[PDB]
Amino acid sequence: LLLQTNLINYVTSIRPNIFVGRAEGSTQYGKWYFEVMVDEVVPFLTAQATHLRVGWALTEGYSPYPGGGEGWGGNGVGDDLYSYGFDGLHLWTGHVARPVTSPGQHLLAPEDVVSCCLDLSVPSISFRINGCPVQGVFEAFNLDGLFFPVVSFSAGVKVRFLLGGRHGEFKFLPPPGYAPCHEAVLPRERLRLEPIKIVLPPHLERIREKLAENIHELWALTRIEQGWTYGPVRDDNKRLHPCLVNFHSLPEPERNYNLQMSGETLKTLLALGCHVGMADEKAEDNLKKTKLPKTYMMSNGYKPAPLDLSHVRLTPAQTTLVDRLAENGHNVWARDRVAQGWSYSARLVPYRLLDEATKRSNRDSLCQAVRTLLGYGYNIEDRVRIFRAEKSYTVQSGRWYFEFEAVTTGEMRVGWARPELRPDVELGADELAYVFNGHRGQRWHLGSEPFGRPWQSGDVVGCMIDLTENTIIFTLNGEVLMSDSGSETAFREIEIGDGFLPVCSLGPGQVGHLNLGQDVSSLRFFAICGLQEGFEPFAINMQRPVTTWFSKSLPQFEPVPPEHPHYEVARMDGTVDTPPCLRLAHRTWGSQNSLVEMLFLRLSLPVQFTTTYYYSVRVFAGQEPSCVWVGWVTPDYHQHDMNFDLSKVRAVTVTMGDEQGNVHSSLKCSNCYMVWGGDFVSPGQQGRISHTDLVIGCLVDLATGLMTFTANGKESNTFFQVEPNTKLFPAVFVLPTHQNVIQFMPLSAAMFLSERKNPAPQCPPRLEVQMLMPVSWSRMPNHFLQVERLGWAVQCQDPLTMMALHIPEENRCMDILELSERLDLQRFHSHTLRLYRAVCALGNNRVAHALCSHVDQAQLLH
Amino acid sequence: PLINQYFTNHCLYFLSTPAKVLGSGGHASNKEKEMITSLFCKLAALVRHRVSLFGTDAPAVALLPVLTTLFQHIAQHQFGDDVILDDVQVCSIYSLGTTKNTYVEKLRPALGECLARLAAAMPVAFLEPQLNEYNACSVYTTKSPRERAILGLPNSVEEMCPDIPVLDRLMADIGARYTEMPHVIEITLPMLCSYLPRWWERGPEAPPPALPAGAPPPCTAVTSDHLNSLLGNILRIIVNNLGIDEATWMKRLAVFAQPIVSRARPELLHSHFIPTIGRLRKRAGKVVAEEEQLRLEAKAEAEEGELLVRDEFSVLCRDLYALYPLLIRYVDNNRAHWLTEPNANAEELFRMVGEIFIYWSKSHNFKREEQNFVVQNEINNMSVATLKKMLPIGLNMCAPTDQDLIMLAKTRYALKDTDEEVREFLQNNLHLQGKVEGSPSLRWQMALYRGLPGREEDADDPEKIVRRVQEVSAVLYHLEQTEHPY
Amino acid sequence: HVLDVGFLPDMRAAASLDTATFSTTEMALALNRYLCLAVLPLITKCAPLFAGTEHRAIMVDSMLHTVYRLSRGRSLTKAQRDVIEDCLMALCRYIRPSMLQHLLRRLVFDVPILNEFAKMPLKLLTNHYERCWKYYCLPTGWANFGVTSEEELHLTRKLFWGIFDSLAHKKYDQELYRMAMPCLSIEKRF
Known part of the structure; x- marks a missing residue:
């Protein structure tokens, strides 16, 4: 019932820039073997047991946010379903600490190695202990994303990655069919460690024949003039060239070889939306044979006589179509090769983003054909991050200034803002911001307005505010920006309001450095526009760096505000004839019909010990059985992932079963599926299947005592529409049943722990329906972990720890310092400290001994 | 059908650039063809407004076969020689009566989409015939001599080379190294064309009657040209106009030519301290000349007392004619130098000692008798942003910057001490009372924390308080300007 | 009021040559056009008031009976000023001048309608995103105006400028994606 605290170590995870994925297409064999050895000397650092564990990560975890974590603190990897890990004896999948059986049940002691193998055919991940295998591994997980090789580590852990290509001296032999960076890894990049997050038209015949002849006449002459003829001996591995023949009497294999490309040229040209027509009729007769000094004669008898194109250049536009056609051709070739080739050669991968040189050559291969045709005459035409200082730094009056450095030159914004800057809204889109955009040279407030020249590299932009005169004057590299209306950065008549607060935003793939003048010398100029103008x-x-809170990305839970425009709920009073119920509403007009709005209940349902071992979803009778089960404590939140269909209501009612506690989540119009939800669910939208991974695969030493279950089943969606089949719309009352006690019944009795024996349905004010908001705020820690060559091994020594709150009901950590801006849990925590002091009253020492357990000497000293 | 056709051209004008960057060629050429049938038409009502508007935005590769304007390429050159050759003889018609049709044709400075094979004919078609009338020609005052700078585009000819039109005729007539062999042939006229006006140092404007009509076009054009290889031409180009403007030092040089040429090329790219160190003292001498205007208002004011004399046409008729037109172009000198001067001021105090020592009299003497500038500025404010008011626009960021005690808080303390409407005679009193503060105030970490690192040798003297005693006093007069104007 | 009082002019519109005596209602409404003229309400315009605009245009063009030219000017002023309190939904009232005013060669009452028709693009330029009906009615009306006025019109400067405008209520994103119907090439159009 009360918030908890304790010191917690920072944990961070890093990876090499290696990506492995699988889909219906190119896969790079989709199975890889991962190896890394450890070097640690710290069984126990200052705070607690040092945490390290290795595994995979399917590019949608985003686990490391230094600070708040799902359980206690910022655990590195394996603490969620979007990651998998192993620390010597554990299967870490979503805060689950199940160990395994293997000789030498010890942690990652120094001079130990671990081997990780991934299989694409069956979804399976297995680990290899220093000399032993694992007696149980997890399977049946998702595959939609690239799987990182990731290592998690606390302070004091050093590990060395092993690749096999150049320095990965594997102690274990690679398994039969896993290639450690052999054919292609990052074709357009390199390796490095990174921290995570019957009738045919004769027109076509003649065009094709002329094209094919004009392009194939060059091959014979080139191959006979280059003099790359065969040696006196008959060598079959010398890459003999059967194509060294005439371009007219070429045989059937050469005919087929030319036919594919010749037909594909016209096939791709007819699908580009060009207009067939003889535009100018100029190149047909203007073909001038260029001058050639008499050295062109060669003893081979075939003088080099190419068609003149030294002055016939069309445009860079059709080069795009040529490149697209070349990419399509090489993609088709790659598909054909992958279908049957399976060549173990230093083999190629999708060329759409392979490399600059090869792609340029591929484009030029058809660029020659396009240019020759022209010379002949036939010519044919997820979100943005936001950063701001904490509200306590809000300034009411004066003259204030700071500098932003724009390293990249993409979508980045700079300006001031009111303290209550709502996230999930682009900077400057409303009245709560007065910012500038340098990607397009336009200023932003309640809408775009052109202003000032756009940015360049570095381009340290100064921002200014004068609360006395209500003016905001941006400065760019020591020169004051100018407006098109003859004014100086027109944001005139800006009221004081509740004070102003600096803010910046970064789009995807952007880098920014802002200097709020914590130290005098870091500012760039501050001597041309602010030195003597009072501008300060x-x-x-x-005495300390400014907090500079940032914007989260994880979609946490927030209560439904009673002031929401088009989402109005109602706590209908429970009567004798009807159980208490809650409804919804929507502004059924031209307003925003949002996505599947995920609704949550307030408090939890932890299963005992299990006495349930299953769930009973019911529409009108026994529905689809075998509802997912965990048989553990596992507090469950009832979820209503309903879709707004511009309809009346999708209500929920807290009914009571005959001898079991069951919900009643009514709906009336269209498709809306509502089942239980885990306490760490954080998905987006647009997905109905494959949202539960990491099934349990524990077994025995003989792999015989194997039991499996659909572990971590959060959204066990019930598509109700399969139950009825009619051309109407009657009310559907889905009433899943899970609460099971001795009744010799409502939802609230089990979940409130006070009126447990009372079976009357109740909805105390503690119960409030919540929705799932995508982005919230957060605090940037003022200190991070410090940390890498000679095999790119990572060395980390500096210790770092924070003291962290905890909400037992919601089961999620959070840094204590967030209370400096929450101002709703800060008051409660101050009052609970006062309660601790009051109950440890004057002249009492038993209660003091009891209190030395909820808190600790080290925690108080910190 | 004239007004509505012209009106819709204002909106649907720039449609070529953002949309259909290469596909807009047929549209733009099609409209221009019909605009030529109105050349013959003569009407009593003026229709010239639609003529300039239509061609101003009409331009807004080889795929133009339906474009009969390919045959219209020679049409434009045809009218070029008609007026100039006939006007050589050219009084009632020595005016814009025959030149009113030449402004729309010439002006095509940036929007270039077609070549029209008109490469080097224009320098000989009209420019060389225009050179015939450059000198006096024993004719009256020229009617439109500024058309040479306007209609003569600043190197918007796509090719320049001497001795080609007079010698290379059959070589191009018969028909891949082009425009690269004359890499040094370009600099044959500028080495000679610039030599004549520079040596000219006459006082009155009469000896150079038509000289200002030809000075702008060459220097402004070729300065941009050939910047990639030869930076020296840009270097000496700044000196070219710098020497010629020395003749502006006299209080009465031009009453009509002064504003035309001042706004003709307010451009300086290599006239700053690093390229032209002497430009600081060169313009400093102009500051001394500019100070002579201040004595006129003070001297005539004494005689104007109590209306003892005919002050209607004597006292006021002195400063309005000379002072107002001069200072149009001096604003850009400090504006361009303001990017480096405070940084150079941060580096050393000698960066703008002369600039600080000057421009004080611009507002010091113009506290009263302000109507002398408004009447001479009728073209500007008749229709706030007066040129006189913006005179210290660059000074207020530099003149009070380096006064004394770069970071010692004495600057603000001195301003407070003299914030008493102190008279010029009474300014000595504050030097005897003293006002300083080594406060624990905002001088802590940011204010007055650039200055000491920036003042490696912070020269502070008891006499230097007098220098700072004048900076705040100037701000006292500028204080009432914002409130009083209303 | 616009529902209750506004019903009365709709009934009163039915007077061409049959009444000839009941001009009392015409004067009663004519002397009380200040009430509607003096306000600019219904910026939201949630309710459909295009019927009221159509009726007002009808009485503007209803000069066949007694018109009381002073009251005619009063009605013209009321209609012209009412064009500011609406958010451009009177599609029928927008297409009516194309059918009536554009067709007429300033015969009797086309000039007062053309005044407002030319005044509308002044506020509709660079704003007032068009719809399907608006985008379809724009080119036909523009072509009719630009073919009819050039030659057979008089030499009156006010009459010439009474329709002389660009008249392009173009949108920002789009207005209509239906098939263009020249009878049922953008370079050759204008």
């Missing part, structure tokens, strides 16, 4: 920087007197 932000951090005039700070």
Whole structure:
């Protein structure tokens, strides 16, 4: 019932820039073997047991946010379903600490190695202990994403990655069919460690024949003039060239070889939306044979006589079509090769993003054909991050200034803002911001407005505010920006309001450096527009770096605000004739019909010990059985992932079963599926299947005592529409049943722990329906982990720990410092500290001994 | 059908650039063809407004076969020689009566989409015939001499080379190294064309009657040209106009030619301290000349007292004619130098000692008798942003910057001490009372924390308080300007 | 009021040559056009008021009976000023001048309608995103105006400028994606 605290170590995970995925197409054999050895000397650092574990990550985890974590603290890997790990004896999948049987049940002691293997055919991940295999592994997981090789580590852990290509001296032999970076890894990049997150038209015949003849006449002459003829001996591995023949009497294999490309040229040209027509009729007769000094004669008898194209250049536009056709051709070739080739050669992968040189050559291969045709005459025409200082730094009056450095020159914004800057809204889209955009040279407030020249590399942009005169004057590299209307950065008549607060935003793939003047010398100029004008920087007197809260990305849970425009709920009173129920509403007009709005209940349902071992979803009778089960504590939140269909209501009712506690989530119009939800669910939208992974695969030493279950089943969606089949719309009352106690019944009795024996349905005000908001705020820690060559091994020594809150009901960590801006849990925590002091009253020492358990000497000293 | 046709051209004008970057060729050429049938038409009502508007935005590769304007390429050159050759003889018609049709044809400075094979004919078609009338020609005052700078585009000819039109005729007539062999042939006229006006140093404007009509076009054009290889031509180009403007030092040089040429090329790219160190003292001498205007208002004011004399046409008729037109172009000198001067001021105090020592009299003397500028500025404010008011626009960021005690808080303390409407005679009193502060105030970490690192040798003297005693006093007069104008 | 009082002019519109005596209602409404003229309400315009605009245009063009030219000018002023309190939904009232005013060669009452028709693009330029009906009615009306006025019109400067405008209520994103119907090439159009 009360918030908890304790010191927690920072944990961070890093990876090499290696990506492995699988889909219906190119796969690079989709199975890889991963190896890494450890070097640690710290069984126990200052705070607690040092945490390290290795595994995979399917590019949608985003686990490392230094600070708040799902359980206690920022655990590195394996703490969620979007990651998998192993620390010597554990199967870490979603805060699950199941160990395994293997000789030498010890942690990652120094001079130990681990081997990780991934199979694409069956979804299976297995680990290899230093000398032993694992007696149980997990399977049946998702595959939609690239799987990182990731290592998690606390302070004091050093590990060395092994690749096999150049320095990965594997102690274990690679398994039969896994290639450690042999054919292609990052074809357009390199390796490095990175921290995660019957009738035919004769027109076509003549065009094709002329094209094919004009392009194939060059091959014979080139091959007979280059003098790359065979030696006196008959060598079959010398790459003999049967194509060294005439371009007219070429045989059937050569005919087929030319026919594929000749037909594909016209096939891709007829699908590009060009207009067939003789545009100018100029190149047909203007073919001038260029001058050639008499050295062109060669003893081979075939003088080089190419068609003149030294002055016939069309445009860079059709080069795009040529490149697209070349990419399509090489993609088809790659598909054909992957279908049957399976060549173990230093083999090729999708060429759409392979490399600059090869792709340029592929484009030029058809560029020659396009140019020759022209010379002949026939010519044919996820979100943005936001950063801001904490509300306590809000400034009401004066003259204030800071500098932003724009390393990249993409979508980045700079300006001031009101303290209550709602996230999930592009910077400057409303009245709560006065910012500038340098990607297009336009200023932003309640809409775009052109202003000032756009940015360049570095381009340290200065931002200014004058609360006395209500003016905002941006400065660019020491020169004041200018507006098109003859004014100086027109944001005039800006009221004081509740004070202003610096803010910046970064789009995808952008890098920004802002300097609020914590130290005097870091500012770029501050001597042309602010030195004597009273214009005075932000951090005039700070003994510590400014907090600079950032914007989260994880979609947490938030209560439904009673002021929401088009989402209105109602707590209908429970009567004798009807159980208490909650409804919804929507502004059924031209307003925003949003996505599947995920609704949550307030409190939890932890299963005992299990007495349930299953769930009973019911529409009107026994529905689809075998509802997922875990048989553990596992608090479950009832979820209503309903789709707004511009209809009346999708209500929910807290009914009571005959001898079991069951919900009643009514709906009336269209497709809306509502089942239980785990306490760590954080998905987006647009998905109905494959949202539960990491099934349990524990077994025995003989792999015989194997039991499996659909572990981590959060959204066990019930597509109700398979139950009825009619051309109407009657009310559907789905009432899943899970609560099981001795009744010799409602939802609230089990989940409130007070009126447990009372079976009357109740909805105390603690129960509030919540929705799932995509983005919230967060605090940037003022100190991070410090940390790599000679095999790119990572060395980390510096210790770092924070003291962290905890919400037992919601089961999620959070840094204590967030209370400096929450101001709703800060008051409660101050009052609970006062309660601790009151109950440890004057002249009492038993209660003091009891209290030395909820808190600790080290925690108080910190 | 004239007004509505012209009106819709204002909106649907720039449609070529953002949409259909290469596919808009047929549309733009099609409209221009019909605009030529109105050349013969003569009407009593003026229709010239649609003529300039239509061609101003009409331009907004080889795929133009339906474009009969390919045959219209020679049509434009045809009218070029008609007026100029006939006007050589050219009084009632020595005016814009015959030149009113030449402005729309010439002006095509940036929007270039077609070549029309008109490469080097224009320098000989009209420019060389225009050179015939450059000198006096024993004719009256020229009617439109500025058309040479306007209609003569600043190197918007796509090719320049001497001795080609007079010698290379059959070589191009018969028909891949082009425009590269004359890499040094370009600099044959500028080495000679620039030599004549520079040596000219006459006082009155009469000896150079038509000289200003030809000075702008060459220097402004070729300065941009050939910047990739030869930077020296840009270097000496700044000196070219710098020497010629020395003749502007006299209080009465031009009453009509002064504004035309001042706004003709307010451009300086290599006239700053690093390229042209002497430009600082060169313009500093102009500051001394500019100070002479201040004595006129003070001297005539004494005689104007109590209306003892005919002050209607004597006292006021002195400063309006000379002072107002001069200072149009001096603003850009400090504006361009303001990017480096405070940084150079941060580097050393000698960066703008002369600039700080000057421009004070611009507002010091113009506290009263402000109507002398408004009447001479009728073209500007008749229709706030007066040129006189913006005179210290660059000074207020530099002149009070380096006064004394770069980071010692004495600057603000001195301003507070003299914030008492102190008279010029009374300015000595504050030097005896003193006002300083080594406060624990905002001088802590940011304010007055650039100055000491920036003032490696922070020269502070008891006499230097007098220098700072004048900076705030100037701001006292500028304080009431914002409130009083209303 | 616009529902209750506004019903009365709709009934009163039915007077061409049959009443000839009941001009009392015409004067009663004519002397009380200040009430509608003096306000600019219904910026939201949730309710469909295109019927009221159509009726107002009818009485504007209803000069066949007694018109009381002063009251005619009062009605013209009321209609012209009412064009500011609407958010451009009177599609029928927008297409009516194309059928009536554009067709007529300033015969009797086409000039007062053409005044507002030319005044509309002044506020509709660079804004007022068009719809299917608006985008379809724009080119036909523009072509009719630009073919009819050039030659057979008089030499009156006010009459010439009474329709002389660009008249392009173009949108920002799009207005209509239906098949163009020249009778049922953008370079050759204008």
